[PDB]
Amino acid sequence: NMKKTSQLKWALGENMAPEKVDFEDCKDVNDLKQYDSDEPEPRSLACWIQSEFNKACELTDSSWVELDEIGEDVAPIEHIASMRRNYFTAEVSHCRATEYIMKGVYINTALLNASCAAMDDFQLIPMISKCRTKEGRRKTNLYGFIIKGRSHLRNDTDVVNFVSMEFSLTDPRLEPHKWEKYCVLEIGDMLLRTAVGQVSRPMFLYVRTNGTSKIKMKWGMEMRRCLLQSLQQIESMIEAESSVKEKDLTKEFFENKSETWPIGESPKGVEEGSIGKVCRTLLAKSVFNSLYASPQLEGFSAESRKLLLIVQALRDNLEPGTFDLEGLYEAIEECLINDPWVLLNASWFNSFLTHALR
Amino acid sequence: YSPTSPSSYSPTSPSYS
Amino acid sequence: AAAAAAFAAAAAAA
Amino acid sequence: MERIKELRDLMSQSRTREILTKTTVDHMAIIKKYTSGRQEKNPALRMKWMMAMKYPITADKRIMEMIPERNEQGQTLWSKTNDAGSDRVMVSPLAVTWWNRNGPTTSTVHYPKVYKTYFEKVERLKHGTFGPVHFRNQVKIRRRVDINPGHADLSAKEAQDVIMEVVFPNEVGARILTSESQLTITKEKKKELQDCKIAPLMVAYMLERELVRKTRFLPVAGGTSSVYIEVLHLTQGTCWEQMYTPGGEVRNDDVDQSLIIAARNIVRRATVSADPLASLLEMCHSTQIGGVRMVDILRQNPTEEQAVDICKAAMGLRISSSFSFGGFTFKRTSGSSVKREEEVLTGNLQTLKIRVHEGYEEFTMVGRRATAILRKATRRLIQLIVSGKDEQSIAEAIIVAMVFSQEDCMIKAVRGDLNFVNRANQRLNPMHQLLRHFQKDAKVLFQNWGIEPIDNVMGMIGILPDMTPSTEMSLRGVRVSKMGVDSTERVVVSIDRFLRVRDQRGNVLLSPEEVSETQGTEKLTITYSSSMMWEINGPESVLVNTYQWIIRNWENVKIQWSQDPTMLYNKMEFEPFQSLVPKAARGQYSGFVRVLFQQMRDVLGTFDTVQIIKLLPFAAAPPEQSRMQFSSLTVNVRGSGMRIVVRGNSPVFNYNKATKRLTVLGKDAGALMEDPDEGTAGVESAVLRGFLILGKENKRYGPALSINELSNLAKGEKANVLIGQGDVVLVMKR
Amino acid sequence: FEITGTMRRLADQSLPPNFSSLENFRAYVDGFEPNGCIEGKLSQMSKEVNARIEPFLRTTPRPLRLPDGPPCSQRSKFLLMDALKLSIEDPSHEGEGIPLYDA
Amino acid sequence: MDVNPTLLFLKVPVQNAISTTFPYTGDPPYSHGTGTGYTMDTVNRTHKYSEKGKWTTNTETGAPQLNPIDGPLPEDNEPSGYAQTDCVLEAMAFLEESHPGIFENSCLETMEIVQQTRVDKLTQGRQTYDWTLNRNQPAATALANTIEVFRSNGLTANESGRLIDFLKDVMDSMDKEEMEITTHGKKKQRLNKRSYLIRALTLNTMTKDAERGKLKRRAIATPGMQIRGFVYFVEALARSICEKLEQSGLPVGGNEKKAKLANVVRKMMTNSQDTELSFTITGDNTKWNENQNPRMFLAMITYITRNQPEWFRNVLSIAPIMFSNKMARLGKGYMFESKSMKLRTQVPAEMLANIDLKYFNKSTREKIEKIRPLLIDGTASLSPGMMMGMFNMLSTVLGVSILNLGQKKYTKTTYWWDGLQSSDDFALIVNAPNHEGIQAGVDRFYRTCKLVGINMSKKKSYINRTGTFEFTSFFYRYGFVANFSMELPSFGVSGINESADMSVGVTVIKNNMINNDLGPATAQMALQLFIKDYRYTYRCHRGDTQIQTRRAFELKKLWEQTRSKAGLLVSDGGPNLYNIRNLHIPEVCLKWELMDEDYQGRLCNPMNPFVSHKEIDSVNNAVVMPAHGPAKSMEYDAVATTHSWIPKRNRSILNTSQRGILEDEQMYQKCCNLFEKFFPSSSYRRPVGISSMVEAMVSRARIDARIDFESGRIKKEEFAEIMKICSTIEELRRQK
RNA sequence: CUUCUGCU
RNA sequence: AGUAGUAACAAGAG
Ligand SMILES: *O[C@H]1[C@@H](OC)[C@H](n2cnc3c(=O)[nH]c(N)nc32)O[C@@H]1COP(=O)(O)OP(=O)(O)OP(=O)(O)OC[C@H]1O[C@@H]([n+]2cn(C)c3c(=O)[nH]c(N)nc32)[C@H](O)[C@@H]1O
């Protein structure tokens, strides 16, 4: 538990809620007004989100998902499923997005347990994640600390505030709008090694006062579902071709890399990645949906799905016709307000429209 | 099998020497 | 001379 | 005894006394669920949140005397606090773990007997056999399948009667067991449930599970029996099939039904072959039903069926020449008939397409409680002599005979709410629906059938609509015999090359034409072990696999079609598809497609890969020249005529140009490789027999024309024709 | 099962505007027979209420208009790409598993 | 190298990859605060969409009412509720002609239902507005409270146990001059006839929490106990009718629904002429509930019940009559704050009719100003439209009638149409010789819908060539596509109990493999992830693990004591033995052959205190709410084990005025649980009888005591004591 | 103050 | 402050 000092009592928003009294007791107050209900402040897109997504689809050595062993395989189908699963696990365990999944799940699990247990006390929660290096040695990494506040969470939408401190090697002034809510302090001269010999890049601690809800914590600790949404889709893409060729196409798609899908764009034009890159990209998309989930994402997803279906019908020479196209565009555009993930998704949709009609 | 893709001191997982 | 009826899928009348 | 003491104590309290006195037993069902706790609208979060608190579980107050308040580590196992709204105390999961660790143990020999439904699964999985896994283009159709087979000789009521009698013998009520099966099951369960302390509610629930039949709509591809549906997830996949043979014994009815479905599919496929007898022998020797070769099953299972008997004759076994209808075994003693679909209107205004049989025929019906001699003509009962043991049996036999007659007077007798399509909108068998409806209520049918005078004959007594026998009047062509009617016997027969079974005197007993055309589903999975592993599959699978084979072998099929199309057409890979094309239109479609391919070859260029892939299966049958022009080709699929459009894409057969992929009935069939020789260059040349599609209309050569009207053109002239989905195009007659 | 009293007044009030009694409306419905009311009303209805089908061509859909306000900022509960992890190559100390010890 | 997952659609067809477009891995958008704003907005929108109707004032409730029926025809594509009665009646008549005897047979069945339906059936469902407390209560509690109130007021006809008698009692109560209710200090309150009527026709309103695919939140409504009685019969009739309609895909569910839709669409595509161009229209109807007027349902009920007995017509038509006079309760109210004084406060919705407008913002001020005329005793009159209408089946029937009207024999033109309709969603297939014919057919269908008030949402609808469409989130691409993202929320720990969770998790994996196209490798990984989540949620990690948890000691001791570790249940730290082979086998039976006899006996001990059994209707059954649709009952196979415990109940009512209700519940349980000790079949089958419980229990005790004595199960002294106690109980009941 | 509660 | 977004939370009832 952390001592309830003035700095923590301010950063954790203690006593900030106005005292609740019956209307007959304050009906005459001059400034008494209904709660503010204005629209969210609009914001434009930035390259940092796209850069972060690119990073999330990268390959690493630290494996983040060690799965408990299932019962022994007996049926030949079980042996084939195990052989495939191997490729899926090897491809998805080294993905950075899996690192985000493991760290996010641990943080939300720790926050929920501490919230239900120490309702009235500030708690220090280390952000510890476990991985396995290339040589197989098990390594334990610390990303920083979280100070959890008062957690009298009655409703499923109540908010618990917490101060998060994250070690980093990044100049906040270099890109300031990305860190508008953070207070970054230089805390050390880390002797990172590189190859020349050693670099003394300074450590930047991003101290920010964040907040999470009970429902948000519950959905956060279930972020492992992302591993299913991507892999199931990938399997559906594998099993379809296997049905067509009547042969197991796992080795052909992963090792031989005979088949490739359009997964990105560059100055030269659309870039095509193998099944591994597709799986990593779909996983990263699902992970970011979980991390940046919001009502705007739900609205834009539904409306853009309608537009995607219309464009698909057009591509299939189905002579699609609309009754009010501007109405649909307005519905899609009303959902692009503040969330960086939704703005990035809209930019991706614009790129897809550009590439799908030419 | 090695998950592989054609695409120092990583700010995420660096060395300390 | 009780005998069976092979396959059958019917119920009783009223 | 303490229950009376508790009741006295409750009576002592004023509020409890008032509640007990005012609330009737009838009112109990309402106050029993009178709670304040509202059903959780998000149980996952509430469970994840409550596991963190100290005491999330609720345990009976008795626990306080059965578990120490704290373990050896000092952790509190329970609390004196009382759960809100009950006497149950609030306890931690440590209490559950402690009980499982060093709580009071008891004998558990009763659990496998009470949970027989769950343990039988493990018992049959332990003895199950796994075959090779075959990757295929699985086509899973949604239909009702058995989840819990229950007891075949007990209905819902019978099951409950036994349940109640076994679990609550005192609370049974006025109900009484009235069947040998009910008595045997009750005796066995009572013997098995001796000194069972398990909660009676769980015993009743488990018995209900084991006895009451339960069905659910599932997407199945293999057998629909419960032994197969439970392992459906493991056996049938989206792109693979796992050969599995569940342990234990299999229901004889399931084997009989599966054998019937397999034999019908085999005969339907072998009928379109060049050597039907050789094809049938090979298929029968390669097919397996639930892991048992069909060759050795036909020698032990009679399953009298117009297809089973044929297969047996081919195998050399003696046949029965009998078919089961409405629980009666019919044996055709004399006469012959030919099937034909006819459209009729019932008494409830519904319209049906029934398979009417033409020709005079004479049958012997043998039933568990009746025996009759019947003589019928085309939609008319000539005579019927029943020898039922009981009046109820007489009524049942007469109703079956009237329905089998198909007389118009009976179709018009249909009244009330009768549906010929289930909730899933699938088309039911009209004869079975009529039989079920008339067995439920036969008063209207008897009233409207008709009455005729009786010729006084010794031993023959008439029967009237009110079921009372009469000597002067009787139902039209109906007599009752009190002396009995004679008897089952298997007669050796000879089968020719074309599956036409004949007796020792040469009279033709069975032919492939009388085999039922319904494409059903097998209770027990049927496995085929030939190169064409989908030879005896259902319609959708046959179509998808046929086009998939065409696409996979396209690099060779194109060469063969361009060089030696006559031999390619006779490829065996198209025979199963021909089984789905209507018999009447088979030759017309073959001749039409063969001419279309020849004209496409004559006209240089104009090669169309999609058109060849689409129309190739229709060229297999022998040609039959005609002047007819077909806008679409019909293929039978589970009683529905699917139309394949000659020009353009249709839901049945579609080619996506964007992805260059073929889909048949919504199932992907493969991608078409980019062919430099294609060069469509606008002109089609493969839509009309003897006519070339020039392209877009120009409003100069003519306003519009019909497909048949286009026959007026002599030669060389160009005109606009309305062909396809409202797409008028310019055409030239050679 | 008779409708009377307050129920009857409520029923009499919950009817189309040209009706004033439940029994009158029930009698009208019992004797009702179609006589082309739909065709007449469709003819009478204005011609501007229509579901005109505007074709969707390759040049019809434009790109989505994104907001023009200030640049968006990080809102994740934790750093994603800028995070630095301090780690122990192999946990071999006493108390391994407890987060405070490892931290 | 900017990666972009959307570009994947350049190769894979959108439908085949539709799962990718579902963000269901994130938390659903919940609603914060009160639903008063959404309810007032819904009322204002409902009255605005019918603003050209006739305004009247009810002679009973005294509240203004709006009658948009037979109003002006729509002069613009703006949503309009002016449905025409003649057009609705004509559509119903054509529906009857196309399916002769549908109404007669449906009425015959519905009638029988009415005769055989008991009062207990109202206990099914949840969150009913208990007019005796002005709060939402469980259906059973609201029903009991209403019954007790009626008995105290002289309405004693509901004792027959038939639902029709309770409806009759409701009618008599409506005619009652004054009503007496009890409150708790167990005070008594008197309600005048007008006030009773208003609180009897009142509908409570809340916000639809956890709804996906929508940005703006919405408000849902729950009716009272009086309305539910007639609504059940109306829905039963509509269901009986819909079962006979090919285009109505509402009554069916699950694979049965998909099968029906696939068959229907297939046949529709088939019978279509080869020379006729075909198109498919996909889209919802805008403001469906706000425009479905209850008077139209009354007209349809009257037409359907033609020639039926007058009592049947009255009982069926009572529901639309009450719904036409329905009043919506505004809700929790509003919340105000003072920043300068730094204090919060809440204004109940009942005060909005008299509160000053300076406290609200411009939007809420306008909403209050627009709803003030309709505000009566804290409830707003809501005669027009159907706020969260329970007439889903009736509305589906109306839509199907409009769909059926598109046959070539009714259009009398080259074009024709058919399709599918469920609630407010539909998929229309139009066949015409040419594009001009298709356009004419679409316009005619749209105009006919407007005629009936139904109005296609041009904003969220599109038309393409026949073959691909979307219906109720089911994407048809020459065949329904197996979407898996919709079932993702169903994965993970269900949260029922330590034993039901495992069986439900494996059952969910198995069902998804069977239905939603879950690959075997994905199924394996899913199973692994589920076991890991299960272990981390119930703190049931493996005994040999070094993980530290408050439950680690007991599990460690159990693991050391057991000889056969593989036999331990996963809930007891045992290893996981599941795989694709045995996802259908309950874990108790799966490990039975490996369990140690001592542990096996302890775990399955029937005298254990954790296991509790309610009515059989709630045995091995759980309520699961998927991503879309209402709650569904899932049946799972599980053995009665000490792990099948019950979680703690909410105690927030323990420090409120209504705490007495919970106490009463306890008393009732204390009596019902005792009855089970006298009549063992009380749970398996509903007991029947008019005698008081005490009389039945004492009689049964006397009979059992005699039978036990004669058989010798009890001694002479025990029998003498039993009867002595029985006589004392009889005397206690008489003494009072 | 202390008591009571995190869906009521 | 912060969460968050048409209205809440930033404890509540005694
Ligand atoms: O469940 C199916 C079938 O299994 C595939 C099952 N079944 C038949 N026989 C057995 C059996 O011996 N043992 C078991 N366990 N199951 C058996 O019965 C059901 C039949 O379903 P379905 O395929 O729909 O019936 P189908 O075969 O198509 O025709 P059905 O209506 O039952 O008629 C049976 C034979 O009677 C012939 N038939 C009818 N009529 C009116 C006449 C007639 O007037 N004259 C003549 N000569 N024949 C008639 C039918 O054509 C059919 O051959």
Say whether F460 sits in a helix, a strand or coil.
strand
Instruction: Determine the Cα–Cα distance for residues D158 and C11; give it in Å rounded to an integer.
Output: 14
For ligand 1, atom 50, the nearest C-alpha belongs to D516
Structure tokens given for D13: 């309290």
Q: Give the angle subtended at the CA of F393 by the CAs of F389 and F394, to the nearest 5°.
A: 75
Structure-block tokens of residue F651: 């105690």
Question: Among A177, A116, A115, which residue's Cα sits nearest to residue A146?
Answer: A115
Euclidean distance between CA atoms D535 and D266, whole angstroms: 8
Which nucleotides of chain G are near protein (any atom < 7 Å from a CB)?
Answer: 4-8
Q: Cα angle at D311 between D309 and D316, to 5 degrees?
A: 90
In which order are the strands placed within the sheet that holds A33-34?
A19-20, F343-347, F334-338, A33-34
Is F608 a known ligand-binding residue?
no
C-alpha D395 to ligand 1 mean position (Å): 21
Phi, psi of A266 (to 5 degrees): -150, 175
Are the CB atoms for F333 and A9 separated by under 8 Å? no
Other C-beta atoms lying within 10 Å of the C-beta of residue A134:
11
Q: Which residues in chain E have their CB less than 8 angstroms from residue A347's CB?
A: 66
Asked whether F733 and D17 are in contact (CB, 8 A), the reply is yes
- 3-state SS assignment for residue D319: strand
Distances (CA, A) of F325 to F71, F117, F203: 19, 26, 11
Rounded to the nearest 10 degrees, the angle between the axes of helix F294-304 and helix F225-242 is 60
Separation of alpha carbons F224 and F216, rounded Å: 27
CB contact burial A177-214 (16+ within 10 A = b; e otherwise): ebbeebebeeeeebebeeeeeebebebbbbbbbbebbb
- For the four alpha carbons of A81, A82, A83 and A87, in that order, the dihedral sign comes to positive
In SS3 terms, D14-28 reads as HHHHHHHHHCEHHHH
Q: How far is CA E70 from CA A332, A337, D55, D281, D338, in A?
A: 20, 11, 50, 79, 83
Closest alpha carbon to A226 in A349, A56, A346: A56
Q: What are phi and psi of E95, to 5 degrees?
A: 80, 15
- Mode of pairing for the β-strands spanning D380-386 and D478-481: parallel
Angle, CA D324 vertex, CA D320 and CA D326 arms, to 5°: 160
**Beta bridge pairs of residue A59:** A95
- Distance between start and end Cα atoms, chain A: 61
Please state, in angstroms and rounded to a whole number, the distance separating the CA atoms of residues D130 and A75: 6
The closest alpha carbon to F19, from F425, F383, F517, belongs to F517
Separation CA D211–CA F631 (nearest Å): 28
Q: What is the C-alpha to C-alpha distance for residues A277 and F379, in angstroms, rounded to an integer? A: 58
Assigned token pair, D412: 């018009």
Nearest nt (C1') from F364 Cα: H6
Cβ neighbours of E78 in A, within 8 Å: 103-104, 107, 127, 143-144, 164, 166
- Spatial separation of the C-alpha atoms in residues D593 and D633, rounded to whole Å: 10
CA distance A41 to A56: 28
- Contacts of residue D548 in chain A, CB cutoff 8 Å? 244
The Å distance, Cα D427 to ligand 1 centre, comes to 16
Nucleotide of closest approach to F207 (CA, C1'): H7
Strand G closer than 7 Å to the CB of A156? Answer: yes
Of all residues in chain D, the one with the smallest CA distance to C11 is D439
Alpha helices in D115-155 (DSSP H): 116-126
Alpha carbon distance F688, D24 (integer Å): 9
As beta bridge partners, residue D270 has none
For residue E75, give how far its alpha carbon lies from the nearest alpha carbon of chain B (Å).
19
Find the nucleotide nearest A153 (Cα to C1′): G6
User: What are the tokens at F682?
Assistant: 């009380």
Residue contact D93–F538, C-beta within 8 A: yes
Q: Does B6 touch chain A (CB under 8 A)?
A: no
Q: Pick the residue from chain E with its C-alpha nearest to B12.
A: E84
DSSP per-residue letters across D612-624: HHHHGGGGSSPP-
Mention every residue, 6+ apart, whose C-beta is less than 8 A from residue F516. F482, F483, F484, F486, F487
C-alpha distances out from residue D22 to A89, D86, D595, F691, F733, Å: 66, 21, 90, 9, 11
| C-alpha–C-alpha distance, residues D287 and D258, integer Å | 12
Neighbouring CB atoms inside 10 A of D451's CB total 16
CA separation for the pair D157, D212 (Å, rounded): 9
For β-strands F343-347 and A19-20, DSSP reports them as: parallel
CB atoms within 10 A of CB F412: 8
Q: What are phi and psi of F445, to 5 degrees?
A: -65, -45
Please report which residue ranges of D287-429 form alpha helices under DSSP H: 294-297, 308-315, 391-405, 408-411
SS (H, E, C) A291-352: HCCCHHHHHHHHHHHHHHHHHHHHHCCCCCEECCHHHHHHHHHCCCCCCHHHHHHHHHHHHH
- Taking a C-beta distance cutoff of 8 angstroms, is the pair D703, D695 a contact? no
Hey, how many other C-beta atoms are within 10 angstroms of the C-beta on D316?
11
User: Are the beta carbons of D135 and A317 separated by less than 8 Å?
Assistant: no
**Lookup: tokens for E102:** 């490892």
Distance of alpha carbon D543 from alpha carbon D669, whole angstroms: 10
Name the residue type at position D134. Answer: H
Report d(CA D591, CA D385) in Å as an integer: 50
3-class SS shares of chain E: helix, strand, coil, % to 5: 30, 5, 65
The set of residues, in sequence order, having a beta carbon less than 8 Å from that of F674 and lying 6+ positions away, is D3, D6, D7, D10, F697
For residue D154, what is the enclosing H or E element? Answer: none
Sign of CA dihedral D647, D650, D654, D655: positive
The CA distance from F418 to E92, in Å, is 72
- For chains D and F, CB pairs below 8 A equal 450
Q: Using an 8 Å Cβ cutoff, are F278 and F466 in contact?
A: yes
Spell D501-539 as b/e; 16+ CB within 10 A means b: bbeeeeeebbbbebbbeebbbbbbbbbbeeebbbbbbbb
Closest CA-bearing residue to C1' of G7: A155
* Ramachandran angles phi, psi of F46, nearest 5°: -60, -40
**In what helix (H) or strand (E) does residue D364 lie, and over which residues does it extend?**
strand D361-366
Q: DSSP assignment of D41-106, as one string?
A: S-HHHHHHHHTTSS--EEE-GGGGGTS-SB-TT--B-EEEEEPTTSSPEEE-HHHHHHHHHHS---
Measure CA D616 to chain center.
30
CB atoms within 10 A of CB F60: 18
Q: Distance of alpha carbon A46 from its chain centroid, rounded?
A: 17
Looking at residue F648, the DSSP 8-state letter turns out to be: P
Chain E contact for B13 (CB, 8 A cutoff): yes
Q: Which residues of F touch A89 (CB under 8 A)?
A: 525
Give the three-class secondary structure for F220: strand
By the 8 A CB rule, do A278 and A261 touch? yes
Residue A140 parent element (H or E): strand A138-148
What is chain B's Cα-based Rg? 12
Give the residue carrying structure tokens 């006390």. A121
End-to-end CA distance of chain F: 88
Q: In what order do the strands lie in the sheet with D380-386?
A: D322-325, D328-335, D361-366, D371-377, D380-386, D478-481, D460-463, D469-470
What residues of chain E lie within 8 A of the CB of B12, using their CB?
81, 83-85
- Region of D74 on the Ramachandran plot (φ > 0 left; ψ -120 to 50 alpha; else beta): left
Distance F307 CA to ligand 1 centre (A): 41
Beta carbons within 10 angstroms of residue D491's beta carbon: 11
DSSP helix/strand/coil, F252: coil
D244: β partners: D130
The annotation status of F130 as a binding-site residue, yes or no, is: no
Q: Give CA–CA dist D395/F547, Å, rounded.
A: 74
Across the interface, which of D42, D132, D668 has its CB nearest the CB of A76? D132
Residue F480 tokens, joined: 């329904």
Name the protein residue, with chain letter, whose CA is nearest the C1' of G4. F655
Nucleotide nearest to D84 (CA to C1'): G5
Pick from D298, D273, D341: nearest CA to D517? D341
CA A72 to chain B, closest CA, distance in angstroms equals: 21
Q: Which residues contact A206 (CB under 8 A, 6 or more apart)?
A: A164, A165, A166, A168, A172, A179, A182, A183, A184, E79, E82
Tell me the technique behind this structure: cryo-EM
Ligand-binding annotation for F366, yes or no, is no
**Contact indicator for F262, D140 with CB cutoff of 8 Å:** no
Please give the resolution of this entry in Å, rounded to 1 decimal: 3.1
Touching partners of A (3+ C-beta pairs < 8 Å) = B, D, E, F
Residue F284 CB coordination number (10 Å)? 16
Residue carrying structure tokens 């939007």: F363
* Residue F283 annotated as lining a ligand binding site: yes
The distance from CA D371 to its chain's CA centroid, rounded to whole angstroms, is: 30
CA-based radius of gyration for chain D? 34
The answer to whether A244 contacts chain D (CB < 8 Å) is: yes
Q: What is the C-alpha to C-alpha distance for residues F407 and F428, in angstroms, rounded to an integer?
A: 12
